[PDB]
Enzyme design. Structure first.
Site, mmCIF file in Angstrom:
data_model
loop_
_atom_site.group_PDB
_atom_site.id
_atom_site.type_symbol
_atom_site.label_atom_id
_atom_site.label_comp_id
_atom_site.label_asym_id
_atom_site.label_seq_id
_atom_site.Cartn_x
_atom_site.Cartn_y
_atom_site.Cartn_z
ATOM 1 C CG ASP A 167 -2.017 1.083 1.103
ATOM 2 O OD1 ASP A 167 -2.639 1.400 2.139
ATOM 3 O OD2 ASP A 167 -2.225 1.625 -0.003
ATOM 4 N NE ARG A 171 -3.759 5.279 1.907
ATOM 5 C CZ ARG A 171 -4.052 5.108 0.622
ATOM 6 N NH1 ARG A 171 -4.219 6.161 -0.166
ATOM 7 N NH2 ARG A 171 -4.183 3.886 0.127
ATOM 8 C CG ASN A 172 0.426 4.247 3.978
ATOM 9 O OD1 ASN A 172 0.008 4.493 5.109
ATOM 10 N ND2 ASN A 172 -0.209 3.436 3.141
ATOM 11 C CG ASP A 185 1.128 1.630 8.659
ATOM 12 O OD1 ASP A 185 0.237 2.500 8.614
ATOM 13 O OD2 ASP A 185 1.383 0.967 9.686
HETATM 14 C C1 LIG Z 1 6.193 1.333 10.334
HETATM 15 O O1 LIG Z 1 5.629 2.653 10.352
HETATM 16 C C2 LIG Z 1 5.043 3.059 11.505
HETATM 17 C C3 LIG Z 1 4.596 4.374 11.561
HETATM 18 C C4 LIG Z 1 3.989 4.854 12.711
HETATM 19 C C5 LIG Z 1 3.494 6.280 12.797
HETATM 20 C C6 LIG Z 1 4.502 7.057 13.610
HETATM 21 C C7 LIG Z 1 4.441 8.541 13.392
HETATM 22 C C8 LIG Z 1 3.416 9.345 13.065
HETATM 23 C C9 LIG Z 1 3.925 10.569 13.007
HETATM 24 N N1 LIG Z 1 3.357 11.775 12.708
HETATM 25 C C10 LIG Z 1 2.048 12.022 12.422
HETATM 26 O O2 LIG Z 1 1.193 11.157 12.406
HETATM 27 C C11 LIG Z 1 1.700 13.442 12.115
HETATM 28 C C12 LIG Z 1 2.508 14.532 12.431
HETATM 29 C C13 LIG Z 1 2.109 15.829 12.103
HETATM 30 C C14 LIG Z 1 0.880 16.044 11.447
HETATM 31 N N2 LIG Z 1 0.458 17.290 11.106
HETATM 32 C C15 LIG Z 1 -0.844 17.873 11.437
HETATM 33 C C16 LIG Z 1 -1.191 18.807 10.258
HETATM 34 C C17 LIG Z 1 -2.621 19.353 10.367
HETATM 35 N N3 LIG Z 1 -0.219 19.911 10.198
HETATM 36 C C18 LIG Z 1 1.143 19.446 9.898
HETATM 37 C C19 LIG Z 1 2.169 20.598 9.956
HETATM 38 C C20 LIG Z 1 1.562 18.306 10.852
HETATM 39 C C21 LIG Z 1 0.084 14.962 11.135
HETATM 40 C C22 LIG Z 1 0.498 13.684 11.468
HETATM 41 N N4 LIG Z 1 5.223 10.500 13.288
HETATM 42 N N5 LIG Z 1 5.574 9.281 13.531
HETATM 43 C C23 LIG Z 1 3.831 4.005 13.802
HETATM 44 C C24 LIG Z 1 4.276 2.691 13.748
HETATM 45 O O3 LIG Z 1 4.089 1.931 14.844
HETATM 46 C C25 LIG Z 1 4.780 0.675 14.943
HETATM 47 C C26 LIG Z 1 4.890 2.213 12.587
#
Ligand SMILES: COc1cc(CCc2cc(NC(=O)c3ccc(N4C[C@@H](C)N[C@@H](C)C4)cc3)[nH]n2)cc(OC)c1
Length: 307
Positions: A167, A171-172, A185
């Protein structure tokens, strides 16, 4: 389902972090990656025990089942095996004892690639309108190709570790404070049940990123990821555009079979569009590899202007 003390979480001294070394903060992602919060970790690195590091923490929801627990563990263990790379979301640690399972990963402060690009849309003519109430500085032509390069490099690494994403989409892909592209992911457990072609997530339809062979025959290879990378390329040069605009799912099945492809975005060079088309080749064996993609994009970055 059952209490967390009812199970046996795998302890790994190399990755295990005490819970009081985490200061939990605000929710991240709006749950696109599941229940993930921002946090501050104290002495994440043993060499600097008095240093604070911003991290992302994934945990189970309140309605989590025994399956969900297994998946989160599997995701964590998969990230261990796959190893580290600059252009993926890396594992930083975990909390497995004295409470709920916490998987600690890298924090990307600028959100996913789609919202990142949309907020930097110029108020011009060759893009849709900037939906952000907090617009940022426009990106040069070399920044966009560089975004594609970094994502390609991440996938090249993932492919080298026998990892199929299934996927790959804007978005990812997450963006750090230093504008580093990190693929998210990639260690997810593949669903053992048959797919629903019309499910939602936001209102995103993952069917529009799938290669025809993955769409019709559920066959997932590195070449199917290459197809997805093509759609991701199209997403970049439309600055977060929506694939096949105005085309529903039932029409997408027919169209793809007929050899229909998305047109070139208004602001995209012919060379970069051929790259999309090459990624969107009907025959999986005829699509370029990520190794080849990284090489081409490297050449193109050097030639692309940032003026
Ligand atoms: C293997 O892969 C992963 C990934 C993850 C996700 C970890 C993660 C997520 C984020 N970050 C955000 O989710 C994020 C940050 C800022 C956002 N924004 C809000 C927007 C309105 N303004 C923008 C200026 C910023 C919107 C979303 N970092 N690490 C977890 C995981 O578990 C095992 C595995």
């Amino acid at each position: 389902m059952a209490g967390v003390s009812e199970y046996e979480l795998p302890e790994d001294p190399r990755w295990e972090l005490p819970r009081d070394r985490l200061v939990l903060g605000k929710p991240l992602g709006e749950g696109a990656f599941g229940q993930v919060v921002l946090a501050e970790a104290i002495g994440l690195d043993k060499d600097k025990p008095n240093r604070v590091t911003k991290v992302a923490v994934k945990m189970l929801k309140s309605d989590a089942t025994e399956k969900d627990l297994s998946d989160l563990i599997s995701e964590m263990e998969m990230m261990k095996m796959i190893g580290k790379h600059k252009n993926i979301i890396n594992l930083l640690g975990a909390c497995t004892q004295d409470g709920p399972l916490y998987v600690i990963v890298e924090y990307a402060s600028k959100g996913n690639l789609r919202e990142y690009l949309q907020a930097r849309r110029p108020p011009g003519l060759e893009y849709s309108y900037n939906p952000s109430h907090n617009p940022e500085e426009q990106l040069s032509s070399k920044d966009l190709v560089s975004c594609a390069y970094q994502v390609a490099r991440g996938m090249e690494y993932l492919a080298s570790k026998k990892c199929i994403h299934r996927d790959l989409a804007a978005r990812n892909v997450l963006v750090t404070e230093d504008n580093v592209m990190k693929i998210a992911d990639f260690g997810l457990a593949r669903d053992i049940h048959h797919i629903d072609y019309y499910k939602k997530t936001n209102g995103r339809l993952p069917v529009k990123w799938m290669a025809p062979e993955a769409l019709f025959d559920r066959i997932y290879t590195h070449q199917s990821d290459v197809w997805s990378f093509g759609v991701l390329l199209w997403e970049i040069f439309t600055l977060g555009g929506s694939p096949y605009p105005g085309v529903p799912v039932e029409e997408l099945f027919k169209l793809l079979k007929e050899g229909h492809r998305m047109d070139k975005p208004s602001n995209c060079t012919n060379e970069l569009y051929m790259m999309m088309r090459d990624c969107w080749h009907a025959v999986p064996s005829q699509r370029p590899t990520f190794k080849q993609l990284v090489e081409d994009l490297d050449r193109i970055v050097a030639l692309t202007s940032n003026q």
